[PDB]
Design a protein around this ligand. Structure first.
Ligand SMILES: Cc1cc2nc3c(=O)[nH]c(=O)nc-3n(C[C@H](O)[C@H](O)[C@H](O)COP(=O)(O)OP(=O)(O)OC[C@H]3O[C@@H](n4cnc5c(N)ncnc54)[C@H](O)[C@@H]3O)c2cc1C
Ligand SMILES: [Cl-]
Length: 408
């Protein structure tokens, strides 16, 4: 006898996870004519934190045919950011780079955004399975050849074959855990506490949609307008600072909103309208982002920190670049490893510029001009462009010459 698989399936690509990284990777691979299975453990739409987008998402949204859908759904447009940071808020506009061609991104309720992308992946031909939890990879020697998954409330697991398996599991870090290959950023051990508020004030004109990021003595606040009526407000601090305080994360959030200058003003007539939520211990990079038969993308590969709101752009740039790499690997299997090593090189270049800048920006002793020159020092050391243009290029999640997030 044999372990036989009732209704056994085989796909070109298995994508594990249907957040922005997995749905973008899967949809773009289906657009390229491949057979794609996407396994998502939850039912969409499903709650997620991580709401402020930057203009680096726009090229992937365009490739997915979603530019007009973003406007139909009515997500809040975001023309730039407000920073009460360093030595009243200073601001930037997304139009300061790229000759003004990307004027705005969005603030999004993630359940709705992630469901738009997953529904679009299905429309493009992906077989999306919901309630499907990947348990372990399947191997032929070192090569990943498929996965084993469980369906909620069903006794029997399912084995499925795939020529390449993409780990898009976000902070669940499926393959980082499998291979014990997570490299933690031990200097970025932070905790976030957040809730939702009705009645917050809004800036005037185009600035209505701005994120506000406000520095505090030992942390910082975000203030994200999702709509005219709802604001996402969170406090981020090193876990050591919260622990030292003896306060709960929820009490600390309440204290920081009240004691802050700008968020305190903006919330004078506000009311909390949801539970408190927390997250911590999010900053790491995996040792490798591929191997024989597999690739990692989005937070499953790496995450920096919420300061400067880059994660969903890292994820969708990742989906765009991994879909191109995986397609080239399927067409020319002899070059699979080379193509996936190039994918990782490019990801690491983009990621590292943002990691170095986030670590720099965390020094709240500098001024606006210092932050601009810091961005220029990373992405434009020969000063082809003004420092304020370089700042906006970097914090927009764009990169010159990068086909997935090019400066327009
Ligand atoms: C406090 C906080 C604030 C943030 N704010 C922002 C922000 O303002 N802007 C921004 O761009 N980013 C932000 N981020 C980061 C952002 O949330 C993530 O980078 C983003 O969700 C990455 O998406 P992803 O597709 O890589 O993973 P996710 O979006 O988390 O999706 C992964 C999916 O995999 C599924 N999954 C996991 N394990 C399995 C399994 N075994 N089998 C099947 N499915 C599985 C999950 O159910 C999930 O749907 C923030 C993060 C934190 C912690
Ligand atoms: Cl982020």
């Amino acid at each position: 006898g044999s372990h036989m698989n009732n209704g056994h399936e085989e796909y070109d690509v298995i994508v594990v996870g249907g957040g922005p990284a997995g749905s973008s990777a899967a949809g773009l691979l289906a657009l390229n004519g491949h057979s794609v299975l996407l396994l998502e453990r939850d039912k969409f739409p499903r709650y997620h934190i991580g709401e402020s987008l930057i203009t680096g998402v726009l090229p992937t949204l365009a490739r997915l045919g979603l530019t007009e859908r973003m406007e139909q759904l009515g997500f809040q447009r975001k023309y730039g950011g407000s920073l009460l940071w360093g030595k009243k808020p200073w601001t930037f506009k997304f139009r300061e780079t790229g000759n003004g061609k990307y004027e705005y991104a969005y603030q999004v309720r993630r359940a709705d955004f992630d469901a738009l992308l997953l529904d679009r992946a299905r429309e493009l031909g992906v077989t999306v399975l919901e309630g499907a939890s990947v348990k372990e990879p399947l191997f032929d020697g070192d090569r990943m050849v498929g996965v084993r998954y469980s369906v909620r409330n069903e006794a029997e697991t399912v084995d499925v074959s795939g020529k390449i398996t993409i780990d898009a599991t976000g902070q669940q870090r499926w393959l980082g855990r499998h291979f014990d290959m997570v490299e933690w950023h031990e200097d970025l051990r932070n905790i976030a506490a957040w809730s939702y508020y009705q009645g917050g004030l809004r800036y005037e004109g185009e600035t209505e949609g701005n994120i506000l990021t406000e520095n505090r003595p030992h942390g910082w606040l975000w203030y994200i307008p999702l709509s005219k009526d709802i604001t996402s407000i969170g406090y981020v601090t090193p876990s050591s600072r919260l622990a030292e305080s003896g306060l709960t994360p929820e009490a600390m959030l309440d204290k920081q909103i009240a004691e802050s200058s700008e968020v305190g003003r903006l919330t004078a007539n506000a009311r909390r309208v949801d539970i408190y939520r927390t997250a911590r211990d999010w900053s790491y990079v995996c040792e490798r982002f591929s191997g024989p038969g597999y690739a990692l993308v989005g937070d499953a590969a790496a995450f920096i920190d919420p300061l400067l709101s880059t994660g969903v752009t890292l994820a969708m740039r990742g989906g765009s670049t991994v879909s191109r790499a995986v397609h080239e690997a399927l067409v020319d299997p002899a070059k699979e490893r080379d193509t996936l090593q190039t994918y990782e090189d490019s990801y690491r270049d983009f990621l590292n510029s943002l990691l170095e800048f986030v670590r720099f920006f965390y020094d709240r002793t500098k001024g606006q001009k210092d932050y601009h020159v810091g961005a220029q020092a990373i992405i434009d050391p020969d000063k082809h462009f003004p420092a304020n243009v370089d700042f906006v290029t970097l914090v927009s999640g764009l990169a010159r010459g990068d086909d997935a997030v090019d400066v327009p």
